Ligand binder design. Structure first.
Ligand SMILES: [Cl-]
Ligand SMILES: [Cl-]
Ligand code: NA
Lengths: 344, 344, 344
C-alpha cells in the first residue's frame, strides 16, 4: 500500500479542465430528435438527457426540456433513489446557478428548508406563506405517545373548525368554530352570538366587564317581579309572650330566595302601656335577618292605634319565620296579624 | 416473437458486476478541473458530474461537489423533469445510503413525506415541527368549492391573528387576535381584558361562574340607587268605595322597571269602624304585585290614628298603579294620600 | 463570427431520433449485477445507473431500482446540487410520465407546489391535507422584523395549545388551551368549565345572554341576604326643627352599598297638631334618595298614635343619613327613634 488516499469504458485525462463525455444531436426540427445517456438491465432502464427543440414526446416534457426518466419496461414497483452519502446537503436551484439562493435544501440530518439553506425545523419555509386547498383542507397535528387524542385546524363551509381527531385521521369532532361573520362558538356549530359557549363560562379573576357604561361585575343575580300569595296567614300571633314564636312557611315559597310578608297590628283600650318593638326575622344558623314594627298600647284609651309594614326577608333553609314582642302588648282590644304575601 | 420479456454508442457486458462507463479527472489543484457527462442539442444541454477538489466554479457548487446542471445556452423557459414511471417512490437520502431513513419521499400517488416513507397526507412531516417565517407569515386554508370564504392563521406585531381571506389570498380581515400578553379579542384588535368580545356573549348552558367565591350566575341584573321624584301625588284617593281605583304613572317613570311609592293615611273621629287592609298593586295581565297598608278607623274617637308605608312595586306595561280598600273608611276626619316618590 | 446562435469523448449524430450512449447488463441473477455511469475525481464520485433485478446492494436501493448516488470516497461535507439555470420549473413526476400531474414543482422564482404546477405561496399543497407528528409537534410562526414575539399551535397531552415562542423556537409559554373534552382555557391550563378565562371578560356590545330562558344581561349585580346590626341607634332625633338633621353611619356599614334602617315614632297628648311627613334620605352630591314616614300629632288627645317603617337606602360616600320633619311635632309626650338595623 502507499497511504495515498486518492470499468468497461474508461475515459481519464488529468487536466485543469473538465474531462467530458458528450452526446449531442443538433437536429432542430425533428419531432423525435434528442440526446441522452441510458443505463439499462433486461427489464427497464434510466435515461438522462435533453430533447430536441422540436421534440413532441410529451412523456419526457416540453420541446427542449431536460429529463431524468426512470422507465417502465417490464419492471414494476421500482424506486428512483437520489442519494448523497455526504454530510453536505442536497440543494435544488431553479432560475439561477449555485450562486443563487437554493430553492430547496435537504440537510444531512433530515431537515428540509424552502428558500433557506439553514432550516430550524424538519420543514422550514423562509420568508413566505403556506397554503393548503381542497373541499375541506386541514392542518393536522398527530400525537404519537398518546392514542387517538389528536387535533386539527380545518375549513368547512367558510367556517374555521378546530376539531379533535383520531390516530387514523378520519373522524373529526368539531369543538370550536369561527364563521366568516366573525362569530365564535365553543361546542356550538352555528354561532349567532359574537361568542357562544355551550357550557359554563368562568372568570377566574377580574369578573365580567359590560359594554353600556363599562359596568364591571364579579357577583351574582337579583330580581324585579314576584309571585303574589295575597293575604295568606302564617298563623295566630300570641299577644302574651316576649319569647320567640315560630311559623312555618307555605310549601309554595319553600323553594324561594326571598319572601314578602305583611304584619298589621292595632290596639284600643289595651291592658298594658309601653313601646313594643315587634321583631320579625329569618334564621340561617347563627345569622338572623331582622325587621321591626312598633306597637304602642296605651291602657284605658278611647281610641284605636294601628300600624303595619310590608317587607322582604331572605327565605332560609329551615322554612320558618319568627316573631318576638319586646313587650307583650296583651290580647285585650288589640290584634296582630301576620301574612306571607309573596315570594321570589 | 419469443414471448421472452427481456444506440450510437453501446456498452454491454453480461456479468455479476456493474457494467460501468466512467469519466475521471484526478487533477487535485486545478481551479477548472472536473469530470462530467453532457447531453446537448444546438441550444442548451444538461451536465452530470463532479468538480475537482480545487474547482472554484461556484456556479456548480463548492469544490468537490457533485451536480446535475441544466444549462442556459440560447434556450429559455425550459424545465428539468425528474420522472419515475413506476409504482415505487422517489426517495431522497442525505447523509446515508439507501439503508438509512429517506429524508424525503414522493410516492407514486402524489403523497410527500418528510422523514417518513409512508405519508398519511399529501404532505406529512414525521417526528418534527414546521415553521414559517417572514414579516407577516401565515398558514392559509383555501376552500375550492366555495368562493372567497377562506381562512388563515398569521402573525403580525406579535399578535396571533385568525383572519378570513379571499380566493386570491390578498385581503385578510382579522377576526380573532391573541397578544403576547395572553389576552384574546374577538372582533377587538387591541385586547386589554383577558377576553374581549365586541358583541354578545352567550352561555347555552351552565351560565357564568365568578372568581370571588366561585359565584355561579344564570340570571340577569338588579339595582342599588334610584331617581327620586319627591312627593309627586298620583291623584286623589276615594275614601268611599272598595272597588278598584286606577292611577296613571308620571311620564318620567313610564320607562322604569320598579317604582317606589309612599302611602299615608290618618283617621280621627271617623264615620266607620273596622280594619281596612288597603291594597296597592300593579298589573301584568293576570298577574298582580301586591302591598297592603292598615287603616283602622274608629268612629267617634277623640284622637287621630295614622299609618304610612313606602315600598317598591314592579313598573308594568300599562303604566298604572291601583288601590283598593277592603273596607271603605270614609272621608270624615280621615285622609289617604298616595305618592310616587322614585323609580329605577 | 456568423450570428448563428447554435470533449475527451464526443458522440454526435444529427438525426430525427435520440442520439444515445447506452451502458447495459442483462444478468438477471447476479447479486452484484448492474449498469451505471460514473464521474469521479481522486477523492469521490457520482454514479447514475440501475441495479440488476437480483442486486442485493441495499446501499443503492431494492433490486432493479434506479439511482443517483454521490459517493463518500475520501471526501467529506460535499453537496449534491440540482440546478435548473432556466425560467422553467423543476418537476417531479412519480407514477406517470410528464403527461401526468407533477407531484412536486419548484418554480424559477422559488415557489414549491405539491400536486400543483402553479403554486400561490412559497409552499402550496393542492387538494390535500397536511399533518405533523411527534410527541409534541407544533406549527410555528416566526416573525423576523420583531425580536422574540413569535407564535405556535402545538399539541401536548391531547390538549391543543396556542403558545408564544422566542426567535430560537425553544421556550413556549402556553396562552390558550383546548382539551379533547372541548373545554377552552385562556390563561388556564386544565380547563374545567366549557370556557375558563383567568382574567376579566369584556362584552364591548350586546352584553351577556343566559341559557335558562335566554336571559340577556348588560348591567351589574344585586343581593339577597344582609348583615344585621339589631337596633343600633343613629343618635337622638330633635322634635323641634324642620331643618336637616345629619347622623353618622356606624363604621361597620361605611363600606356597604345599602343600609337598612328603622324609624319609629309615637305621639300622645302632643303640643302641636298636623301632618308631619318625616323625610329620611341619603346624599350623593346633588342626588338624594328619599323615604317618608307619617307622624300626625293631635294636641290634647287622651291616646297614643304610633307609626314605624323599615326600609333600604343607598349607602353613599359621605357616610351620613339625614332626617327632616315637614312640621316639627314637638317633644311633649312624643318620640322619634332612628336605628340602623342592617347593611349589605
Ligand atoms: Cl295610630
Ligand atoms: Cl307603618
Ligand atoms: Na298608627
Amino acid at each position: 500500500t502507499s497511504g495515498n488516499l486518492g470499468s468497461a469504458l474508461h475515459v481519464e485525462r488529468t487536466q485543469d479542465a473538465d474531462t467530458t463525455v458528450q452526446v449531442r444531436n443538433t437536429h432542430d426540427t425533428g419531432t423525435a430528435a434528442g440526446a441522452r445517456f441510458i443505463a439499462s438491465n433486461e427489464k427497464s432502464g434510466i435515461w438522462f438527457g435533453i430533447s430536441g427543440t422540436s421534440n413532441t414526446n410529451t412523456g419526457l416534457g416540453s420541446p427542449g426540456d431536460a429529463y431524468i426518466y426512470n422507465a417502465a419496461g417490464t419492471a414494476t414497483g421500482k424506486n428512483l433513489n437520489v442519494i448523497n452519502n455526504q454530510t453536505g446537503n442536497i440543494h435544488f436551484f431553479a432560475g439561477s446557478t449555485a450562486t443563487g439562493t437554493p430553492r430547496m435544501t435537504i440537510t444531512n440530518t433530515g431537515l428540509v428548508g424552502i428558500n433557506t439553506a439553514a432550516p430550524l425545523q424538519k420543514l422550514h419555509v423562509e420568508n413566505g406563506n403556506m397554503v393548503i386547498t381542497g373541499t375541506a383542507p386541514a392542518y393536522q397535528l398527530k400525537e404519537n405517545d398518546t392514542t387517538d387524542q389528536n387535533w386539527q385546524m380545518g375549513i368547512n363551509n367558510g367556517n374555521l373548525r378546530f376539531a379533535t381527531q383520531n390516530d387514523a385521521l378520519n373522524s373529526s369532532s368539531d369543538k370550536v368554530v369561527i364563521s366568516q361573520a366573525g362569530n365564535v362558538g365553543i361546542g356550538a356549530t352555528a354561532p349567532t352570538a359574537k361568542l357562544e359557549v355551550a357550557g359554563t363560562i368562568h372568570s377566574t379573576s377580574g369578573g365580567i366587564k359590560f359594554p353600556d357604561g363599562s359596568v364591571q361585575t364579579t357577583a351574582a343575580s337579583g330580581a324585579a317581579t314576584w309571585t303574589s300569595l295575597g293575604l295568606t296567614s302564617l298563623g295566630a300571633v300570641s299577644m302574651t309572650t316576649t319569647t320567640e314564636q315560630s311559623f312555618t312557611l307555605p310549601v309554595a315559597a319553600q323553594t324561594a330566595s326571598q319572601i314578602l310578608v305583611y304584619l298589621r297590628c292595632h290596639s284600643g283600650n289595651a291592658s298594658t302601656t309601653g313601646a313594643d318593638d315587634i321583631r320579625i326575622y329569618t334564621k340561617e344558623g347563627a345569622a338572623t335577618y331582622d325587621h321591626y314594627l312598633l306597637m304602642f298600647p296605651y291602657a284605658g284609651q278611647g281610641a284605636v292605634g294601628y300600624n303595619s309594614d310590608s317587607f322582604w326577608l331572605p327565605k332560609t333553609s329551615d322554612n320558618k319565620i319568627y316573631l318576638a314582642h319586646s313587650m307583650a302588648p296583651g290580647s285585650a282590644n288589640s290584634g296582630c296579624n301576620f301574612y306571607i304575601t309573596g315570594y321570589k
